[PDB]
Amino acid sequence: NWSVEDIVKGINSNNLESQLQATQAARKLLSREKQPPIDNIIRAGLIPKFVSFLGKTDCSPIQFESAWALTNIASGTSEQTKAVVDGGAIPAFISLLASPHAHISEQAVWALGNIAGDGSAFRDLVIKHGAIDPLLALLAVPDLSTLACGYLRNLTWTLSNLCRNKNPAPPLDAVEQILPTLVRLLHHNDPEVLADSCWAISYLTDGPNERIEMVVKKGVVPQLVKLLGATELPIVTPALRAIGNIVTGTDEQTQKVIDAGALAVFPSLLTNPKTNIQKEATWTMSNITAGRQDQIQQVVNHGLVPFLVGVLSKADFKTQKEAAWAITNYTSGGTVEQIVYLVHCGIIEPLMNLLSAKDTKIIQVILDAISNIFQAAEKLGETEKLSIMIEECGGLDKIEALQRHENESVYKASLNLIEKYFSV
């Protein structure tokens, strides 16, 4: 509607009502779907004026309009977000969290979410300015259901950004301060609150075992497993990420996931029509089969080996690569009986067919698993029985062709295989 030129004229008028009308006009310009003129507004020098309007407690309308305008500037590129921070906006927005007007405090929540979402530095800067205490105070009600639903979703999303990003991860004391509120939100019945809570938990568990432990010790794994079975893709996706993260930790952290019943949802996850769900579920499997023999046994007992055979047989190639890793981890740590069971489920033929892949890493992984299965066969005396199985499905052709392959590890291992199990 208005031109930037006219907005500037109104803002510079030193007439509060004229300034309000011009700030609202800026807000509407910045709120249009078609390429908002953010850089034009910044170049006109308006950010410092918007920031000063955030402090006009006597004129809450101009606080709201300035907050909205600045929110949308901070929603753009890093350099645009930086312009808002450089104008002094962080402490001004934190001051607005205590506004008696819900729509104004909500806009400050939103703006701080955008600023913290830029990256690690601005996230930690929002924290150093003291955003966490007043953010959490807005949620200190006995039942979250009494809060307005849009208000609650905005607070959850902003808290999730305070949990987001690495190098560095969020300060340990900030995480520990936020976590109990996060756990409340993870048990709330709104699907958008649930999704962003799950995302927050997935960020917190994307790191070293000490960070996983701080989440797992709050008892959220059962709720994560429940959400793993949700019908809403926007909930299953972060729930699976968080579960996947947790099983990259210690065998005891992985056991909590198994204890909570996660493996029973993997028949559905490993056949999920959404390829990134299948991929992440198979990746998660590969870190469970890297565990203890008793954890491999629970994978067996839940009937999941046929599902791994399936994904190896037919899936998106990235998923098939995760399955190859799941099998190599299984054969690396499993008992002889567990490895025998894997052959009886049909692993050999799909394993052999993937030796035709161009990818050099997957060849080594598959060759490594064939090795581990042969070592199981040696312990039993059936090395030749296995060599005919690999022969019958056209496998021997592939290991044979592979000793003349560019890779050192591929040529060495494939030749070692030919020499030890396919000779006179």
């Binding site: 949308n72 939103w110 979410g113 979402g117 830029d118 962003d196 995302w199 960020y203």
Partner: peptide, 10 residues
């Protein structure tokens, strides 16, 4: 991961 930034188009 989801979008770190949200514009209010309202």
């Amino acid at each position: 991961s989801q979008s770190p930034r949200r514009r209010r188009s309202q």
